Ligand binder design. Structure first.
Ligand SMILES: CCCCCCO[C@@H]1O[C@H](CO)[C@H](O)C[C@H]1O[C@@H]1O[C@@H](C)[C@@H](O)[C@@H](O)[C@@H]1O
Ligand code: UDP
Ligand code: HG
Ligand code: HG
Ligand code: HG
Ligand code: HG
Length: 263
């Protein structure tokens, strides 16, 4: 709750949009995070004064443990640098986790495969896929009670084309005339409380489907989209936050490619 210190930065013009090529705010007034929309110095101050701790979770089972080295190494260079970070690696191969050198204020926990511990160790949880690498800044601008990320392959598509689950028998069902955006199952997060609510809701929904003998078209991602349709995220991250350059190139609307798939 402490006041920010004196800071010097250019004034923002009220009669000048920051981006004229993209939507920077949703209909429910949640910002859509694109490069140019935020002053990272102001945001860093706000979150540091709060002594914010960010938890980053990844699952690495079977062959996916081979992606951990690059993932963690690049995270050390681009993820929440300057803030307290706690990595949680869930794996079936504890002894296979690479020994990565971490900067100060950052720690790593290996969990072999207790929601209460999250509430006690971190303020925010970020959940992502491990077969990726950070290529640019991914900082506190993403922190909020609940956020989803615009899928790189559908940010420009009409909702009818969104690959939501379309069968009424599934708990993840979303009709052709509903839907705001198509979010990624591989990059979401928010406060520990909101994240656990989302995962708990999706777990229950998937069990109901299982009992009914049906599996959503895109599994977890399908349910996450249904959850975020009914519980609007407080921030939405642009595709800058999860991209595949090999498959999608580098469009003009993307000033930075922050987190990407590994070729
Ligand atoms: C219009 C063309 C779309 C190109 C992207 C397809 O991405 C895939 O989308 C489905 C949902 O419809 C699901 O999310 C898997 C996703 O594929 C993964 O992510 C993309 C970005 C690539 O990295 C693929 O190699 C991945 O398998
Ligand atoms: O049949 C599958 C394929 C992937 N995954 C999970 O999805 C993550 C990344 O997904 P994928 O292998 O599809 O790669 P990506 O789409 O992220 O590039 C992996 O860590 C797994 O935990 C899964 O549960 N089932
Ligand atoms: Hg998580
Ligand atoms: Hg859900
Ligand atoms: Hg689930
Ligand atoms: Hg989910």
């Amino acid at each position: 709750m402490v006041s920010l210190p004196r800071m010097v930065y250019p004034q923002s013009k009220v009669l000048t949009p920051c981006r004229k090529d993209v939507l920077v705010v949703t209909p429910w007034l949640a910002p859509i995070v694109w490069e140019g929309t935020f002053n990272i110095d102001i945001l860093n101050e706000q979150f540091r004064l709060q002594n914010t701790t960010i938890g980053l979770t990844v699952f690495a089972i079977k062959k996916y443990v081979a992606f951990l080295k690059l993932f963690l190494e690049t995270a050390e260079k681009h993820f929440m640098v300057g803030h307290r970070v706690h990595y949680y690696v869930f794996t079936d191969q504890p002894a296979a986790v690479p020994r990565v050198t971490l900067g100060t204020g950052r720690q790593l926990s290996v969990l072999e495969v207790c929601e209460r511990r999250f509430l006690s160790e971190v303020d925010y949880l970020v959940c992502v896929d491990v077969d990726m690498e950070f290529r640019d800044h991914v900082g506190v601008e993403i922190l909020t009670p609940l956020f989803g990320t615009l899928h790189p392959g559908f940010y420009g598509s009409s909702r009818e084309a969104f690959t939501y689950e379309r069968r009424p028998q599934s708990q993840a069902y979303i009709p052709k005339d509903e839907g705001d955006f198509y979010y990624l199952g591989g990059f979401f997060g928010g406060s520990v409380q909101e994240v656990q609510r989302l995962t708990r809701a999706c777990h229950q929904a998937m069990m109901v489907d299982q009992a009914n003998g049906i599996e959503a078209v895109w599994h977890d991602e399908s349910h996450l989209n249904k959850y975020l349709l009914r519980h609007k995220p407080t921030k939405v991250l642009s595709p800058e936050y999860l991209w595949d350059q090999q498959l999608l190139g580098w469009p003009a609307v993307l000033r930075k490619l922050r987190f990407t798939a590994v070729p």
